[PDB]
Design a protein around this nucleic acid. Structure first.
Ligand SMILES: [Ca+2]
Ligand SMILES: [Ca+2]
Ligand code: NA
Length: 327
DNA sequence: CGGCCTACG
DNA sequence: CGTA
DNA sequence: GCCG
């Protein structure tokens, strides 16, 4: 019954199997740290399947037939049901390698490959990295400098204040341009690690050159701690707070209005939902999906979409609102 | 056996 | 590589 | 790790 792709089923923000899904997601993260994206994907998919179930899993029987559950994922759930812990998960959680790779990869500018090299070189703490600034890109230096603030969850009050200052800079740069909140907050999350905004203009072509003008205006008002023709900017903002300020990660994306439904769909996520949707598009429908469009490679044409709904329909999928894309 | 999302900075 |  |  349960469809195999995450884009074929609603996944709400609040679900009934958090304990099991979190354990599988530890194994997925660990698989990524060891360089097996395939195992990561399977463990992520299996966790997502549990998020889409209508009720708590209490019996191994209830896993029968579910997609992406084989011997390994089923054994993990079995142990959790019988004993409340899975030895493999606990061994991973308590391992120095897992703990350090999680610490390093959570830095803005550091991924698995970089963290692994630092691990192999003996480094273990943020202080170790600060001790060796020559080994850091400018992006990594900013990530490390603002790490404490960037580890603090971004809340809705932060989003509203940020949207206001982004709208003001955007309006100064180009009358009639619009700002749309995307990412997890658009899916209904109450917190996030960053805020995502999608910027366009109703007249095709007027948005050319917009993002540099927006960034200059934000930087002139003292709002930019880090950034850097371009159409995406992964920034750190200096967000005013009562009597002070805190650093907040902000992503800005500019798209022409012809691409806006594709950009909105891509940037609203979740990350697993969108990878699954792009996989479905290519493997099941023979069409190539990205944040710019949906391409038929045999006719060499792009699908004209006015809404996210149009895209789902052209893929033969029942429409899912953003709050049901929490795969 | 091999595939596993995508492309910009 | 990083965004992730 | 799971699946086409
Ligand atoms: Ca986000
Ligand atoms: Ca983001
Ligand atoms: Na990172």
């Amino acid at each position: 019954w349960m469809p195999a792709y995450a884009c074929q089923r609603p996944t709400p923000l609040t679900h009934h199997n958090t304990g099991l899904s979190e354990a599988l997601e530890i194994l997925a993260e660990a698989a990524g740290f060891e360089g097996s994206e395939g195992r990561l994907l399977t463990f992520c998919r299996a966790a997502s399947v549990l998020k889409a179930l209508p009720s708590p899993v209490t019996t191994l029987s209830q896993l029968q037939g579910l997609p992406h559950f084989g011997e390994h994922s089923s054994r993990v759930v079995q142990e959790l049901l019988e004993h409340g812990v899975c030895e493999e998960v606990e061994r991973v959680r308590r391992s120095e390698r897992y703990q350090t790779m999680k610490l390093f990869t959570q830095i803005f500018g550091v991924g698995v490959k970089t963290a692994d090299r630092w691990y192999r070189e003996g480094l273990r703490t943020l202080d170790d990295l600060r001790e060796q600034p020559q080994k850091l890109t400018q992006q990594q230096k900013a990530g490390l400098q603002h790490h404490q603030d960037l580890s603090t969850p971004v809340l809705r009050s932060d989003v509203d204040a940020l949207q206001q200052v982004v709208e003001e800079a955007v309006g100064q740069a180009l009358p009639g341009a619009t700002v749309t909140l995307t990412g997890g907050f658009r899916r209904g999350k109450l917190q996030g690690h960053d805020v995502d905004f999608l910027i366009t203009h109703p007249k095709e072509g007027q948005e050319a050159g917009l993002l540099p003008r927006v960034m200059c205006r934000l930087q002139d008002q003292g709002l930019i701690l880090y950034h850097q023709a371009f159409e995406r900017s992964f920034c750190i903002f200096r967000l005013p707070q009562p009597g002070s300020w805190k650093a907040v990660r902000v992503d800005l994306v500019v798209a022409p209005v012809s691409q806006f439904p594709f950009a909105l769909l891509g940037w609203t996520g979740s990350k697993l939902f969108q990878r699954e949707l792009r996989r479905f598009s290519r493997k099941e429908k023979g069409l190539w999906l990205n944040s710019h469009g949906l391409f038929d490679p045999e006719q060499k044409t792009f699908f004209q979409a006015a809404s996210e709904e149009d895209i789902f329909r052209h893929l033969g999928l029942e429409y899912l609102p953003p709050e049901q894309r929490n795969a």
